[PDB]
Amino acid sequence: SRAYDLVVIGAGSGGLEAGWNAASLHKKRVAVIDLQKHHGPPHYAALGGTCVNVGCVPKKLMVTGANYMDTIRESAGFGWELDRESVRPNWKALIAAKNKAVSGINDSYEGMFADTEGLTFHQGFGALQDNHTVLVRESADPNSAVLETLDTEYILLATGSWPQHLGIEGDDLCITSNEAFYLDEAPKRALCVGGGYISIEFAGIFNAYKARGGQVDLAYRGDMILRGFDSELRKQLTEQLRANGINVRTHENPAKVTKNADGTRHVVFESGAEADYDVVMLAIGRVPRSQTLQLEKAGVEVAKNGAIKVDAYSKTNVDNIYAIGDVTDRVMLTPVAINEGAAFVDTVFANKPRATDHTKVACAVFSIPPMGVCGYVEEDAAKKYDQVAVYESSFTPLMHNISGSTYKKFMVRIVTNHADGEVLGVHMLGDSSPEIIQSVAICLKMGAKISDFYNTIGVHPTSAEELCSMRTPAYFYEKGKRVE
Amino acid sequence: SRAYDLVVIGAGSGGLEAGWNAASLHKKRVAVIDLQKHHGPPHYAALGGTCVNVGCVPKKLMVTGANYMDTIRESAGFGWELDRESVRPNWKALIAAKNKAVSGINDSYEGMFADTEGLTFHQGFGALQDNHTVLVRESADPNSAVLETLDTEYILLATGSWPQHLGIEGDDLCITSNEAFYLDEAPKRALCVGGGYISIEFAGIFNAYKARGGQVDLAYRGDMILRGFDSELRKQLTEQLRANGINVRTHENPAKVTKNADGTRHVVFESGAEADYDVVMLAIGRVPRSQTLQLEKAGVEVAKNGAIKVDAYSKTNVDNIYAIGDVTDRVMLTPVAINEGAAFVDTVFANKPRATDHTKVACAVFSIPPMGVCGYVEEDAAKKYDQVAVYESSFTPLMHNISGSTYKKFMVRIVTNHADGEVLGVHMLGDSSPEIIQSVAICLKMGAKISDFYNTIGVHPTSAEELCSMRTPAYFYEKGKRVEKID
Numbered sequence: 028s029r030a031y032d033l034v035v036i037g038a039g040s041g042g043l044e045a046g047w048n049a050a051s052l053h054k055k056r057v058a059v060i061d062l063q064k065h066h067g068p069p070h071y072a073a074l075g076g077t078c079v080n081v082g083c084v085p086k087k088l089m090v091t092g093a094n095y096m097d098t099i100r101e102s103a104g105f106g107w108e109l110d111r112e113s114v115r116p117n118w119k120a121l122i123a124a125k126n127k128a129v130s131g132i133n134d135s136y137e138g139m140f141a142d143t144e145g146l147t148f149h150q151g152f153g154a155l156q157d158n159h160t161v162l163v164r165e166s167a168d169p170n171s172a173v174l175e176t177l178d179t180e181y182i183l184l185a186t187g188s189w190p191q192h193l194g195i196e197g198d199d200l201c202i203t204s205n206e207a208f209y210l211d212e213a214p215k216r217a218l219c220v221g222g223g224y225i226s227i228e229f230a231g232i233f234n235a236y237k238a239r240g241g242q243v244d245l246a247y248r249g250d251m252i253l254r255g256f257d258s259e260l261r262k263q264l265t266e267q268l269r270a271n272g273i274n275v276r277t278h279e280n281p282a283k284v285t286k287n288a289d290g291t292r293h294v295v296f297e298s299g300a301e302a303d304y305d306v307v308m309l310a311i312g313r314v315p316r317s318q319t320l321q322l323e324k325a326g327v328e329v330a331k332n333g334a335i336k337v338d339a340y341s342k343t344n345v346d347n348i349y350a351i352g353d354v355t356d357r358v359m360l361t362p363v364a365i366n367e368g369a370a371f372v373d374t375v376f377a378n379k380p381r382a383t384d385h386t387k388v389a390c391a392v393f394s395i396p397p398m399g400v401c402g403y404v405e406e407d408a409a410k411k412y413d414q415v416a417v418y419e420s421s422f423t424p425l426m427h428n429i430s431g432s433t434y435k436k437f438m439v440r441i442v443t444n445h446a447d448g449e450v451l452g453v454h455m456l457g458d459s460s461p462e463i464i465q466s467v468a469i470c471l472k473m474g475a476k477i478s479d480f481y482n483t484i485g486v487h488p489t490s491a492e493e494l495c496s497m498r499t500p501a502y503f504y505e506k507g508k509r510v511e
Numbered sequence: 512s513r514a515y516d517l518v519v520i521g522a523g524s525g526g527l528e529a530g531w532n533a534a535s536l537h538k539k540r541v542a543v544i545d546l547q548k549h550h551g552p553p554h555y556a557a558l559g560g561t562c563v564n565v566g567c568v569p570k571k572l573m574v575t576g577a578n579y580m581d582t583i584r585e586s587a588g589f590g591w592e593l594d595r596e597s598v599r600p601n602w603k604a605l606i607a608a609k610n611k612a613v614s615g616i617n618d619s620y621e622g623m624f625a626d627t628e629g630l631t632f633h634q635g636f637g638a639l640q641d642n643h644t645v646l647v648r649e650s651a652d653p654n655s656a657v658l659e660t661l662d663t664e665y666i667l668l669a670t671g672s673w674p675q676h677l678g679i680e681g682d683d684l685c686i687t688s689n690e691a692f693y694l695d696e697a698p699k700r701a702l703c704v705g706g707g708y709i710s711i712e713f714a715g716i717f718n719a720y721k722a723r724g725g726q727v728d729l730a731y732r733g734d735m736i737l738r739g740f741d742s743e744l745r746k747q748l749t750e751q752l753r754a755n756g757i758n759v760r761t762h763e764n765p766a767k768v769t770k771n772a773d774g775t776r777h778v779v780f781e782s783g784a785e786a787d788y789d790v791v792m793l794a795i796g797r798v799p800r801s802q803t804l805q806l807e808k809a810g811v812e813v814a815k816n817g818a819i820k821v822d823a824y825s826k827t828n829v830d831n832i833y834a835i836g837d838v839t840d841r842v843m844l845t846p847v848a849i850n851e852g853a854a855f856v857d858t859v860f861a862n863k864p865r866a867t868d869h870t871k872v873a874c875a876v877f878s879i880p881p882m883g884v885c886g887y888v889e890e891d892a893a894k895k896y897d898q899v900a901v902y903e904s905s906f907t908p909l910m911h912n913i914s915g916s917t918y919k920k921f922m923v924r925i926v927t928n929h930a931d932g933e934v935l936g937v938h939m940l941g942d943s944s945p946e947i948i949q950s951v952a953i954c955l956k957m958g959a960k961i962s963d964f965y966n967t968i969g970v971h972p973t974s975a976e977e978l979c980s981m982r983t984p985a986y987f988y989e990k991g992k993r994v995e996k997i998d
């Protein structure tokens with residue numbers, strides 16, 4: 028009757044939910060394991076995982092800050108007079124606020140254990156010795172000191188992901204999303220490498236807090252940033268990001284990064300262009316973090332990219348060993364991991380097998396301006412259904428006629444299965460779109476039809492009401508090809 | 512084979528909707544009649560209607576303008592340094608800017624007629640001679656130069672509403688929302704008389720652009736502003752208004768208003784209190800604007816309060832005449848008047864009988880901070896279902912711990928029918944709820960249950976994701992009686 032009922036490796040978004048539920052809801056013994064208790068170097072992530080410490084939380088507070096640059100600017104057309112040459116962003120001011128917030132969350136996790144019978148935190152690098160033995164080492168090195176040895180019935184593997192670096196000269200002269208949250212002073216020239224949402228988000232941040240005259244370059248290997256999202260929106264976002272002074276460089280890649288005497292980095296892109304930046308941030312991708320778990324010793328299977336393989340119930344090949352969150356590489360979002368976390372408990376300790384629904388999952392890119400997208404892109408629906416119709420709507424809010432940011436188009440695009448009119452995807456660009464897409468997502472959960480949207484009376488005046496006034500498909504895709 | 516197929520009195524939200532659909536989609540001979548083709552004195556509303564000219568549109572631009580007061584202020588917390596002492600609102604700019612907006616919209620309206628065969632505009636005060644003849648006169652005066660006589664098959668009265676006045680001494684010294692859209696300089700002290708959204712929205716605009724050391728007091732007869740909304744939301748909104756400087760004087764009504772030497776209005780309240788203000792805005796009510804239509808001539812039934820009586824399909828007792836919008840007094844909102852008018856066009860010119868649903872109609876209050884609500888408030892559900900559940904959630908967004916606007920609590924309350932868990936009312940208080948509630952209306956309209964909500968994966972970090980996290984009711988009502996638990 029093993030020392031522990033559950034030993035969760037990773038006190039992240041999914042692993043903490045599992046742990047708390049099992050302990051608080053089903054009187055189980057739970058050892059949770061993470062590398063540190065408070066946010067920040069050397070591990071950046073800590074109890075609460077990547078989201079609280081170096082993810083969604085500080086990222087959003089910071090994107091909130093970055094926004095004032097536009098509002099203060101836009102306030103002009105509405106009659107607000109102020110000494111505008113006197114406006115000066117304070118990065119230190121900001122960072123200290125963020126730190127105060129994230130540490131506040133960290134502190135609440137600590138009291139969460141002194142209130143839960145059975146829930147136990149354990150600091151250190153977890154790794155497996157055998158399918159019931161979870162070693163806690165003082166380090167990531169395989170033969171490093173073994174602090175603990177927890178004997179357990181089931182083992183959940185929720186160790187998140189981690190920034191990806193490129194194999195170039197000067198890779199170590201670049202920072203990643205992790206460091207960026209602790210920059211002492213905001214870069215004047217910064218280079219964001221990557222077209223993902225993490226990179227698009229931080230460029231928008233670096234561009235609001237740059238010294239007058241500064242520059243923010245976003246270099247991405249391919250042709251269009253934000254691969255995976257609606258292509259029509261991808262183009263639109265590129266134009267407005269550029270409109271805010273961000274230099275979008277598609278088809279660029281650092282080739283060799285070097286340090287200038289003054290400490291700034293000199294970059295030579297593959298294209299043959301070079302340029303200097305105070306900061307060069309690497310937002311290439313996040314890889315499943317499994318490597319030092321010694322999954323081999325447990326028998327547990329992994330993919331080629333390091334993703335632990337799990338089925339619908341996030342069960343690995345070994346019956347008592349489960350894996351959730353980003354480590355499993357399904358949908359790397361906080362809510363998804365939390366659902367996978369809550370379901371694993373239903374399944375193994377409540378005997379009511381449930382599997383998380385990774386379809387119709389809402390998400391937002393807090394770029395400036397942001398996106399809130401849910402579901403399929405015409406491309407995937409088009410290779411999935413006989414015929415799909417696509418609706419499109421775009422307009423520049425009146426207020427933007429008045430504020431000056433007239434490049435700020437609101438854009439709603441809808442994808443349906445034309446056979447029965449069921450909504451497969453919703454994609455919006457423009458302010459509030461992360462707020463709006465949340466209720467759009469319940470609709471799609473309930474399988475709403477385009478007729479269900481257009482039949483609802485709108486709330487006016489709102490960007491949202493645009494969703495209820497799309498009755499005609501712009502064009503279609505029939506048996507996989509564009510039509511009409 | 513009659514002069515026109517349709518004569519629409521009122522070129523508004525419903526009015527223009529019906530006009531264009533009937534013409535542009537059924538090739539009917541449509542004549543649209545409005546007092547003026549441009550926003551402003553002397554009529555205020557004009558082509559486009561009340562929403563476009565002196566309502567939703569200008570109001571939303573004036574509240575966006577007013578939000579900057581808070582925004583500029585909260586940027587301090589996120590590290591934005593600037594000459595704070597240099598910040599001054601400039602009403603005249605808001606007003607030029609706003610005017611420029613509306614005009615563009617009015618300008619586009621004329622081209623609508625120019626490019627629509629069968630659609631024609633007619634300027635003046637439409638009056639009824641008889642159920643097939645519409646007199647387009649010179650004024651409201653029955654003894655007005657009859658500018659033209661329209662012969663018609665169907666008549667659609669869609670004249671909207673108008674601000675309701677009090678009959679107190681000096682009522683004539685006060686303004687209404689029609690005038691405030693044209694104020695010359697932002698009032699420094701202002702009285703907003705009314706509990707409704709129009710009044711609450713204006714107190715927010717005045718409070719933001721007011722000269723410093725200034726003050727906006729909001730007086731309402733009832734006990735709590737916004738009669739008709741979720742009781743908790745009203746209460747919380749009240750706190751948040753006080754917290755921002757507005758003086759919510761509940762149980763206060765003006766007894767009389769006189770003019771001071773200096774042009775300011777002095778007011779004595781029924782309670783005996785007195786104060787002086789540069790402006791007194793009455794935003795106590797709006798009444799169906801049917802009085803100068805001579806509905807008697809065509810035999811149209813009208814309720815006590817001027818509301819034109821109509822059935823589910825908008826038809827009046829007079830088979831060839833339909834009434835839509837604020838004038839019928841159903842749900843006085845622009846979207847409703849619009850859905851209503853599209854429906855008429857089918858019913859009458861497409862023989863496809865439609866009746867607008869005035870239920871599960873989401874709407875919003877553009878106060879600061881704003882509200883977005885859709886559905887039954889608990890009280891009402893309580894009278895219609897033996898067991899109603901009430902889940903409530905409130906929190907202060909983390910950004911507001913950093914901004915300083917710590918009083919800013921996002922509040923969500925859901926009333927469900929506890930038997931089957933059907934969601935009957937979703938109500939919010941907080942930034943973005945006007946946007947977030949629009950899709951909840953789609954949900955509630957599709958018959959959503961509370962599991963549908965909490966079973967949806969959340970978007971994080973957002974305010975809306977709270978909707979998907981309310982799985983446990985906070986209290987119930989059993990056969991009209993609130994109880995802490997079902998027994």
Ligand SMILES: Cc1cc2nc3c(=O)[nH]c(=O)nc-3n(C[C@H](O)[C@H](O)[C@H](O)COP(=O)(O)OP(=O)(O)OC[C@H]3O[C@@H](n4cnc5c(N)ncnc54)[C@H](O)[C@@H]3O)c2cc1C
Pocket residue numbers: 036037038039040041042060061062063070072073074075076077078079081082083086151152153154185186187188204225316319320351352353354359360361362364970971972
């Ligand atoms: C910059 C950034 C912004 C993001 N923004 C968003 C957003 O806005 N919204 C959103 O929904 N998602 C966002 N995400 C992603 C989101 O944070 C993740 O999807 C989510 O955190 C995944 O949770 P998880 O359960 O996989 O584990 P994580 O939350 O990543 O937690 C993993 C934990 O395990 C610990 N761990 C690692 N190795 C070991 C070990 N050997 N032993 C013990 N413990 C270990 C880690 O230190 C960490 O604490 C963002 C991510 C990043 C990086």
Ligand SMILES: Cc1cc2nc3c(=O)[nH]c(=O)nc-3n(C[C@H](O)[C@H](O)[C@H](O)COP(=O)(O)OP(=O)(O)OC[C@H]3O[C@@H](n4cnc5c(N)ncnc54)[C@H](O)[C@@H]3O)c2cc1C
Pocket residue numbers: 487488520521522523524525526544545546547554556557558559560561562563565566567568570635636637638669670671672688709800803804835836837838842843844845846848
């Ligand atoms: C300050 C304010 C803010 C508002 N904000 C909102 C909001 O945010 N959202 C919302 O949904 N609703 C809002 N409303 C209400 C909304 O404007 C109305 O519900 C809507 O305009 C009603 O449309 P309608 O078709 O009934 O007529 P209206 O749009 O009022 O149009 C009626 C038209 O008929 C004309 N008319 C009247 N009498 C005659 C006559 N005898 N002869 C000829 N023409 C005539 C008038 O000139 C007017 O142009 C607001 C109203 C006000 C006053």
